[PDB]
Scaffold this active site. Structure first.
Site, PDB file in Angstrom:
ATOM      1  N   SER A 232      -4.116 -11.218   5.076  1.00  0.00           N
ATOM      2  CA  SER A 232      -3.401  -9.922   5.086  1.00  0.00           C
ATOM      3  C   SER A 232      -3.790  -9.140   6.347  1.00  0.00           C
ATOM      4  O   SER A 232      -3.549  -9.686   7.439  1.00  0.00           O
ATOM      5  CB  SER A 232      -3.665  -9.204   3.800  1.00  0.00           C
ATOM      6  OG  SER A 232      -2.630  -8.265   3.532  1.00  0.00           O
TER       7      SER A 232
ATOM      8  N   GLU B  75       6.356 -13.084  -2.018  1.00  0.00           N
ATOM      9  CA  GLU B  75       5.493 -11.989  -1.511  1.00  0.00           C
ATOM     10  C   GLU B  75       6.332 -11.128  -0.562  1.00  0.00           C
ATOM     11  O   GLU B  75       7.189 -11.681   0.167  1.00  0.00           O
ATOM     12  CB  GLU B  75       4.174 -12.564  -0.972  1.00  0.00           C
ATOM     13  CG  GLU B  75       4.096 -12.805   0.514  1.00  0.00           C
ATOM     14  CD  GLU B  75       2.662 -13.023   0.964  1.00  0.00           C
ATOM     15  OE1 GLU B  75       2.180 -14.150   0.848  1.00  0.00           O
ATOM     16  OE2 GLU B  75       2.027 -12.060   1.418  1.00  0.00           O
TER      17      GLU B  75
ATOM     18  N   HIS C 212       0.883 -13.004  -2.780  1.00  0.00           N
ATOM     19  CA  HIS C 212       0.022 -12.530  -1.666  1.00  0.00           C
ATOM     20  C   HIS C 212      -1.393 -13.117  -1.793  1.00  0.00           C
ATOM     21  O   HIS C 212      -1.988 -13.000  -2.878  1.00  0.00           O
ATOM     22  CB  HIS C 212       0.067 -11.002  -1.655  1.00  0.00           C
ATOM     23  CG  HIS C 212      -0.651 -10.386  -0.508  1.00  0.00           C
ATOM     24  ND1 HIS C 212      -0.276 -10.603   0.801  1.00  0.00           N
ATOM     25  CD2 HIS C 212      -1.713  -9.555  -0.475  1.00  0.00           C
ATOM     26  CE1 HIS C 212      -1.084  -9.939   1.596  1.00  0.00           C
ATOM     27  NE2 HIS C 212      -1.967  -9.277   0.840  1.00  0.00           N
TER      28      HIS C 212
HETATM   29  O1  LIG Z   1      -3.854  -5.787  -2.045  1.00  0.00           O
HETATM   30  C1  LIG Z   1      -4.762  -4.915  -2.080  1.00  0.00           C
HETATM   31  O2  LIG Z   1      -4.797  -4.002  -1.217  1.00  0.00           O
HETATM   32  C2  LIG Z   1      -5.782  -4.949  -3.134  1.00  0.00           C
HETATM   33  C3  LIG Z   1      -6.187  -3.741  -3.729  1.00  0.00           C
HETATM   34  C4  LIG Z   1      -7.146  -3.742  -4.727  1.00  0.00           C
HETATM   35  C5  LIG Z   1      -7.712  -4.934  -5.147  1.00  0.00           C
HETATM   36  C6  LIG Z   1      -7.331  -6.137  -4.577  1.00  0.00           C
HETATM   37  C7  LIG Z   1      -6.355  -6.172  -3.570  1.00  0.00           C
HETATM   38  C8  LIG Z   1      -5.977  -7.499  -2.963  1.00  0.00           C
HETATM   39  C9  LIG Z   1      -6.614  -7.896  -1.726  1.00  0.00           C
HETATM   40  C10 LIG Z   1      -7.566  -7.144  -1.026  1.00  0.00           C
HETATM   41  C11 LIG Z   1      -8.101  -7.617   0.135  1.00  0.00           C
HETATM   42  C12 LIG Z   1      -7.729  -8.843   0.649  1.00  0.00           C
HETATM   43  O3  LIG Z   1      -8.275  -9.311   1.799  1.00  0.00           O
HETATM   44  C13 LIG Z   1      -6.815  -9.603   0.010  1.00  0.00           C
HETATM   45  C14 LIG Z   1      -6.278  -9.128  -1.149  1.00  0.00           C
HETATM   46  O4  LIG Z   1      -5.380  -9.960  -1.717  1.00  0.00           O
HETATM   47  C15 LIG Z   1      -4.771  -9.628  -2.870  1.00  0.00           C
HETATM   48  C16 LIG Z   1      -3.889 -10.543  -3.352  1.00  0.00           C
HETATM   49  C17 LIG Z   1      -3.249 -10.316  -4.534  1.00  0.00           C
HETATM   50  O5  LIG Z   1      -2.370 -11.098  -4.878  1.00  0.00           O
HETATM   51  C18 LIG Z   1      -3.596  -9.226  -5.303  1.00  0.00           C
HETATM   52  C19 LIG Z   1      -4.325  -8.167  -4.755  1.00  0.00           C
HETATM   53  C20 LIG Z   1      -5.039  -8.370  -3.559  1.00  0.00           C
END
Ligand SMILES: O=C(O)c1ccccc1C1c2ccc(O)cc2Oc2cc(O)ccc21
Ligand SMILES: O=C(O)c1ccccc1C1c2ccc(O)cc2Oc2cc(O)ccc21
Length: 277
Positions: A143, A219, A249
């Site tokens: 991401s 996604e 994601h």
């Molecule tokens: O996507 C976010 O910003 C988030 C927020 C709170 C908790 C977890 C996440 C996620 C997340 C945070 C950091 C990161 O490097 C990757 C990440 O990936 C996901 C993937 C998901 O499907 C589901 C959520 C996340």
């Protein structure tokens, strides 16, 4: 397509995000979910000062110590740590048979752009100083960490630093303007949302090394990866875009319980070992 996906999707809904959580709640939240994940007992962790960026070596029995992935965690440039992404790091280290350097790069809104890129370039520069060979190195990130991977390669190229053998983007976030818009605001701190090192969809990508982009077809950031592949290929970069059908994601983060997650990571290992020779 696997039943494990539906179980993951239900779990993500079950953690109902109804009230808009503060940054502090979001950090502590993610940090708690990560401490519940078991770290295999053959994972060796060593904290290190990576030329003024706090970091952690992730090593496993089959790690070749001369091969290094600099891993840049996601979290919208706001969230995440050397603790939140240790499981992804230890799995990439196994599949790619390398050491992973996780870095605790400076986060927004306390440290806006370009602090994250300054830290990632510094950690890369420190790996060179301490005897790592670029032809046995890669940069990888998920991401925001995926966009930062690209920003880092651009900033290193422009400064005349030797580029690594390859790079890997997991569901990269490279278009800061389109929940993630608020995390975009906090990173930019007023700066133009098409700032090349913040939104590398607008960066000059010429001369980057072989690039693996893993993204899920289910996604919202699918288009970020597709546009990235188009701009990279138009700039003469050896791009591999893998769209994984029905994947969410950073589905690779769920590798413990999602066969597609562990399969994607084995592919990351293959790509890296191929470009290291
Ligand atoms: O996507 C976010 O910003 C988030 C927020 C709170 C908790 C977890 C996440 C996620 C997340 C945070 C950091 C990161 O490097 C990757 C990440 O990936 C996901 C993937 C998901 O499907 C589901 C959520 C996340
Ligand atoms: O990849 C590098 O080492 C690099 C870094 C910054 C500028 C130029 C280069 C390249 C480079 C530097 C020195 C050299 O002796 C050869 C060399 O080759 C390439 C080839 C590329 O595809 C793409 C880039 C380079």
């Amino acid at each position: 397509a696997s039943e494990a996906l539906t179980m993951i999707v239900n779990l993500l809904r079950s953690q109902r995000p109804l009230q808009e959580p503060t940054v502090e709640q979001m950090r502590a939240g993610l940090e708690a979910m990560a401490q519940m994940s078991p770290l295999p007992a053959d994972v060796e962790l060593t904290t290190v000062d990576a030329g003024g960026v706090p970091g952690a070596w992730v090593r496993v029995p089959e790690s070749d110590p001369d091969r290094v992935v600099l891993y840049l965690h996601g979290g919208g440039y706001v969230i995440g740590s050397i603790r939140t992404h240790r499981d992804l790091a230890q799995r990439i280290a196994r599949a790619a048979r390398c050491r992973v350097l996780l870095i605790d790069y400076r986060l927004a809104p306390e440290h806006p752009h370009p602090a994250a890129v300054e830290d990632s370039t510094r950690a890369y520069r420190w790996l060179l100083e301490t005897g790592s060979d670029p032809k046995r190195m890669a940069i990888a990130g998920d991401s925001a960490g995926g966009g930062l991977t690209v920003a880092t390669l651009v900033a290193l190229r422009d400064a005349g630093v030797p580029l690594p053998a390859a790079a890997v983007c997991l569901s990269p976030w490279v278009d800061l303007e389109g929940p993630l818009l608020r995390m975009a605001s906090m990173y930019l701190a007023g700066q133009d949302p098409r700032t090349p090192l913040a939104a590398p969809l607008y960066a000059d990508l010429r001369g980057l090394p072989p690039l693996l982009i893993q993204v899920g077809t289910a996604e919202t950031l699918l288009d970020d990866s597709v546009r990235l592949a188009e701009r990279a290929r138009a700039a003469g970069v050896q791009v591999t875009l893998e769209p994984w059908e029905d994947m969410i994601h950073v589905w690779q983060a769920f590798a413990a319980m999602l066969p597609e997650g562990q399969q994607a990571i084995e592919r990351i290992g293959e790509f890296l070992r191929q470009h290291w020779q």
